[PDB]
């Protein structure tokens, strides 16, 4: 389902992602834009036999379980398939855990590349929230 910036921004604010840890909404909506382009259903394979799932592209080696990745730690303790739903809660709950490992949002390739050090509050400019 392709979310749309301020619709996603509202849903994420509601789910406590505004200043979660100390990252304002714009970071999360930014990551969601460059990781998945707001499409909940997005999957992508990586070079080790693991796939990235959903809107926040949480990977199956470390974070969720998809029944076929070698080395599955499944830290978020959720089936990866649950991350593909049109309501972002299993993805937001797993995202809260990823941030809590003492590495911040660096865990997200596209937040790093396209959102670290940018004016991330542009991502909610003109959004009702």
């Amino acid at each position, epitope marked *: 389902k392709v979310f749309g910036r301020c619709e996603l921004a509202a849903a994420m604010k509601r789910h406590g992602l505004d200043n979660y840890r100390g990252y304002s909404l714009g970071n999360w909506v930014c990551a969601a834009k460059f990781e998945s382009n707001f499409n909940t259903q997005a999957t992508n*394979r*990586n*070079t080790d036999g693991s796939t990235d799932y959903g809107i926040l592209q949480i990977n199956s080696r470390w974070w969720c379980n998809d029944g076929k990745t070698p080395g599955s730690r499944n830290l978020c303790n959720i089936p990866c398939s649950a991350l593909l739903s049109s309501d972002i809660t299993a993805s937001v709950n797993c995202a809260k855990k990823i941030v809590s490992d003492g590495n911040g949002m660096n865990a997200w390739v596209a937040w790093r590349n396209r959102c670290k050090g940018t004016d991330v509050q542009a991502w909610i400019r003109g959004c009702r929230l």
Partner: antibody
Amino acid sequence: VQLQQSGAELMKPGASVKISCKASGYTFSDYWIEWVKQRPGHGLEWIGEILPGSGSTNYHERFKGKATFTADTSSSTAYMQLNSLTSEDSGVYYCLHGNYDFDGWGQGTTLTVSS
Amino acid sequence: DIVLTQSPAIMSASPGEKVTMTCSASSSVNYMYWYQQKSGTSPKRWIYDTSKLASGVPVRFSGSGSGTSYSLTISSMETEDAATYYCQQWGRNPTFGGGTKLEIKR
């Protein structure tokens, strides 16, 4: 149950064909089904795959645009549509499973593209 | 992504003989998968996650390797191991090797 596929097809160049994979026997929604092409003489090519429950689809560079996968949740069927069929599309197409609970393959649908 | 090459193309072997076929990858792969095909039927996943034997593979098969060079080894060759064994890197976008046909010598 099984992974039962469609029978062989004969198609002209330019047309599009759709192949069924009736994957019955488990929670369909939950497991990726992969599709592979065997050109007798070249061997195997990996086309892509679909996770029927969400409809998340992953393709190999070479087939993004030649292939489209869909799944009908109510008949436990996955479909692979191959479009703009050319002579090089003739081959045996397999649907399969590659996970730790089961790794079954189907027998293949042979496709011949000729006039 | 990676190009995989299987040495050699066809091999002869008697029963009781030890067989090792090799699959090399043009760039490092994290794991390898071997499938067998008997002419007449679909491929069957034989070895997965480099060394794990799929359901029904006799224990006499083993897979090994790392980075670039991987292999499948049959200790006592038996007649029903005559097939083509293909290897595959199942990374960002999978590729299979050209196979190694195993036919028995008589």
